[PDB]
């Protein structure tokens, strides 16, 4: 029994052990209360404005589009405190923990950016934060592990399984049934069991709300498409939500194609995986033929979640959103191109969304089109991955 629908068509649900259901039902009920509570909305808006720096700019990029009929804007989540969109929803979740009287935060993270987000929000809001991170990702994300520790969080390496993000996701789900009374699990994307796909969407939907107001001010009409990369689905659904009912607006999600979809070394389960059940949800998964879950491969470490949020698999199935893939070398080209022609260093995750906008422009240069890319994060973290390869 729930207050809100846990599925999006066939996808979603609550596939957790029985002992975790009360934690999900309690979080659902707190969230429906807070969404109606004007005091919680004004505390969240004040943190997003005066702490995190909302609203973020919408930047036109006239040097990239010259000599074509594409007009491209970038929604600047890279300017948000923390350098990526993940801050928005951690702040909301942290305030939901406090409204439930919890004192402690559990989070998982892969490339480290959700861990840092969760540790900043827990330091600001006086929550005790512990993070699980696969030990192969602790070893390769020295700078984020240190940030987390500077901010007072406990980083717990996970050595089981593949010692990467899905193994840290399992460890969070093993700790919460013994701690949900005083600890909230601040999940890092719009996936997992209900209510998380719906809570993370609602706490990221200001991306698209601001983008609609900003593009109507600057061009007097909505975009022809909004384009966002898709690791687990949070930044894209936060850009897409306020546009779902504007039927002329395209919604394009970009999954990582890694070394190319034919090589099998990619992270594109929505269009190239198979539906399974894991991490609390029915959704498309990277998995073997016999149903073992596998890792996603991308040059961008932040597109490593090995499934996808259930609302994107549903918006794909009905034809409302379209999902594509971009390979490591297209993402790298788009990162170099934004650095040199607009003086903006984009995260390599967001570089996959920019790469697809560049192909829409270059493939049809005389097509008139108004495009917004969600620039989910800044890419200072990537500059020597980009160095070492070139």
């Amino acid at each position: 029994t729930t207050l809100l629908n846990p599925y999006f068509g066939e996808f979603g649900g609550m596939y957790v052990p029985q002992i975790l259901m009360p934690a999900l039902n309690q979080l659902e009920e707190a969230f429906v209360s807070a969404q109606k509570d004007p005091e919680f909305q004004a505390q969240f808006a004040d943190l997003l404005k005066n702490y995190a720096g909302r609203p973020t700019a919408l930047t036109k990029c006239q040097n990239i589009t010259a000599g074509t009929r594409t007009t491209l804007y970038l929604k600047r989540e890279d300017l948000l405190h923390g350098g990526a969109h993940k801050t928005n929803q951690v702040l909301g979740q942290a305030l939901l923990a406090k409204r439930m009287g919890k004192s402690e935060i559990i989070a998982e993270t892969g490339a480290g950016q959700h861990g840092v987000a969760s540790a900043l929000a827990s330091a600001l809001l006086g929550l005790k934060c512990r993070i699980y991170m696969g030990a192969k990702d602790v070893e390769r994300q020295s700078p984020n592990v240190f940030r987390m520790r500077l901010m007072g969080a406990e980083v717990i390496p996970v050595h089981s399984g593949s010692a990467t993000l899905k193994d840290a996701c399992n460890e969070a789900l093993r700790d919460w049934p013994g701690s949900y009374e005083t600890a909230h699990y601040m999940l890092g994307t719009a996936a997992g069991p209900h209510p998380y796909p719906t809570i993370v969407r609602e706490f990221q939907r200001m991306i698209g709300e601001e983008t609609k107001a900003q593009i109507l001010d600057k061009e007097g009409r909505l975009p022809d498409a909004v384009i966002a990369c898709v690791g687990g689905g949070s930044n894209a659904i936060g850009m897409f939500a306020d546009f779902i009912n504007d039927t002329s607006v395209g919604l394009i999600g970009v999954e990582p194609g890694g070394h190319g979809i034919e090589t099998g070394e990619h992270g594109a389960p929505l269009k190239h995986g198979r539906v399974g059940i894991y991490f609390g949800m029915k959704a498309p998964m990277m998995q073997t033929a016999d149903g073992q879950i596998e890792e996603s491969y991308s040059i961008s470490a932040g597109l490593d979640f090995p499934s996808v949020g259930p609302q994107h698999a549903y918006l794909n199935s009905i034809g409302r959103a379209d999902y594509v893939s971009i390979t490591d070398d297209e993402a790298l080209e788009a990162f170099k191109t934004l650095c040199r022609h607009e003086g903006i260093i984009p995260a390599l995750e967001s570089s996959h969304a920019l790469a697809h906008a560049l192909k829409m422009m270059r493939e049809q240069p005389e097509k008139e089109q108004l495009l917004v890319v969600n620039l989910s994060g800044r890419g200072d973290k990537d500059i020597f991955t980009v160095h070492d390869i070139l």
Binding site: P17, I19, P22, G161, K166, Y278, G291, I293
Partner: protein, 255 residues
């Protein structure tokens, strides 16, 4: 088949509780697993719970995590586990055999085909660890069409609505996760399948205690799996110490 109903009648005729060990199939390899299992039965197990190795066993602690690691280091797959199960059933026709599965392995290539495969090899029950009663309808219905008992866990704090649903939906036994006196009587009140206490059971006095509280028996897994873990480079020591533990635990269950 009604192997659990047959068992619990037999054990009620003797005022005896069941003692049910858990192991991961294939740990530490198929041949040694099949000897471990035969040792458990000869030493007195009344029924078996058996795990199919899964990449992400999000409801299990470190001892079973590491059992699954060992089985995958041996190349164990779900199809090799179903070959093992058919062999174990052909040696042992009456002991009840339950699987502990993760959902994706049952949903993989189709839930009704997974329960049909169970029925063909002679499995009696399946507990899917990450399917709560609220998500259970296609699993329980497919289990019942293929004469497989769907097992549910009753959590320690289960409210009344949850007790009534586990009662109604489960068969075979109720997995009562580990003063259970109230949840045990409520289960009987609602005509639930008989309760087996599980989690943490590692010594004879707990076996005795679960039967005195009114449960039909007790399940133990990590304690059995730690004996495997401890004895890997002496397979014959492994069998002997498994025999000593199970014989002790089942003796605690006798009246």
């Amino acid at each position: 088949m009604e192997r659990y109903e047959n068992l619990f009648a037999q054990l009620n005729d003797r005022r005896e509780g069941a003692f049910v060990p858990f192991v991961t199939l294939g740990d530490p390899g198929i041949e040694q697993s099949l000897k471990i299992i035969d040792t458990l039965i000869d030493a007195g197990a009344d029924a078996l719970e058996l795990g199919v190795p899964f990449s992400d066993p999000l409801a299990d602690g470190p001892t079973i995590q590491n059992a699954n690691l060992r089985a995958f280091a041996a190349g164990v797959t779900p199809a090799q586990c179903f070959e093992m199960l058919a062999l174990i059933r052909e040696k042992h026709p009456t002991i009840p055999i339950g699987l502990l599965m993760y959902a994706n392995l049952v949903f993989n290539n189709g839930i009704d085909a997974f329960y049909a495969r169970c029925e063909q090899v002679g499995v009696d029950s399946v507990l899917v660890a990450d399917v709560p009663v609220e998500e259970s309808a296609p699993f329980r219905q497919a289990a019942l069409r293929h004469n497989i008992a769907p097992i549910f866990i009753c959590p320690p704090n289960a409210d009344d609505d949850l007790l009534r649903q586990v009662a109604s939906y489960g068969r075979g036994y109720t997995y009562l996760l580990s003063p259970l006196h109230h949840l045990i009587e409520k289960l009987k009140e609602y005509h639930a399948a008989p309760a087996l206490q599980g989690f943490g059971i590692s010594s004879p006095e707990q076996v005795s205690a679960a039967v005195r509280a009114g449960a039909a028996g007790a399940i133990s897994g990590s304690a059995i799996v730690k004996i495997i873990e401890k004895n890997l480079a002496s397979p014959k020591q492994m069998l002997a110490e498994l025999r000593s533990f199970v014989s002790a635990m089942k003796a605690a269950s006798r009246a």
